[PDB]
Structure 1
């Protein structure tokens, strides 16, 4: 392992909104595959269903479009129509409270799912432990 194994509580029974306290945006996967954040709780592309592939390893899927969140070879988040290695994330507890998501494929480089204060997604190499951008709270839909 390249990372700790503190896991968050909560389960995968129901869909969630992934809220980033950094700028207060919900993670959004547009039908065209682009990913960003929005503060509009009424948006229909922020409802996500997480599922466990292995303990602590998850897929994050848009319930509206079926797309899987994925991080590409250059660190950019995108919505994938089919599950692939770029769609697996290591879901962990952080700061004894938040959930973080590390790209399994790029786990050795510490590439996280993260949103900037302006709502745009962070590129993998620009993320790291200690940032506010990588901290999420799963809220009920």
Structure 2
């Protein structure tokens, strides 16, 4: 089943627009916030927009963007945090410890500006319903 990824930080939902853009919206009713989480290997996943077929991927500069094709930049390490929040780490830049995160305003928080402990890197997976 598809999910909604909520960021405790601004109380935003992870969104990927068809223009490749990735930000956060508070509108639980937006079509571009439903994603399908795919397990590639163990602890690894693919995050995909059910609407556009876009994959969430992270550039070399730590910027989030939507990808038309599944690739290296699209895998993330899924971590279940003790508080029952999830964290996602770019697999390509794991050694850098670059996370998926959103500012409080809902803007994408760049991978190297993120860090463990931040509220911007804690997501909660919700039912679309």
Taking the aligned partners of 1:17 and 1:79, their CA distance within structure 2 comes to 16
Q: 1:79 is paired with a residue of what secondary structure? A: strand
1:31-72 Cα deviation digits (max 9, x unpaired): 000000000011000000001001110000000000000000
Runs of 4+ with >2 A deviation: none
**More displaced, 92-101 or 37-46?**
92-101
The Cα shift of 1:95 comes to 3.2
Q: Following TM superposition, by how much is the alpha carbon of 1:96 offset from its aligned partner in structure 2, in angstroms?
A: 3.3
Query: Relative to structure 2, which stretch is displaced further, 91-100 or 120-129?
Result: 91-100
Partner of 1:84: 71
TM-score for both structures, normalised by structure 2: 0.98
Alpha-carbon distance in 2 for matches of 1:122, 1:106: 15
Unaligned runs of at least 5 residues, structure 1: 1-13
Q: Cα distance, 1:94 vs. partner?
A: 1.5
Deviations 1:69-125 (A, max 9, x none): 000000000000000100000000123310000000000000000011100010010
State the distance in 2 between where 1:93 and 1:129 align.
13
Root mean square deviation of aligned Cα: 0.6
For residue 30 of structure 2, the aligned residue among 24, 43, 59 is 43
Which residues in structure 2 correspond to 1:1-141 (within 5 Å)? 14-141=1-128
SS in 2 for 1:100: strand
State the SS of the aligned residue for 2:101. Answer: coil
User: Any unmatched runs of 5+ in structure 2?
Assistant: none
The 3-state SS of whatever aligns with 1:51 is strand
Between Structure 1 and Structure 2, how many residues are aligned? 128
Q: TM-score when scaled to structure 1?
A: 0.90
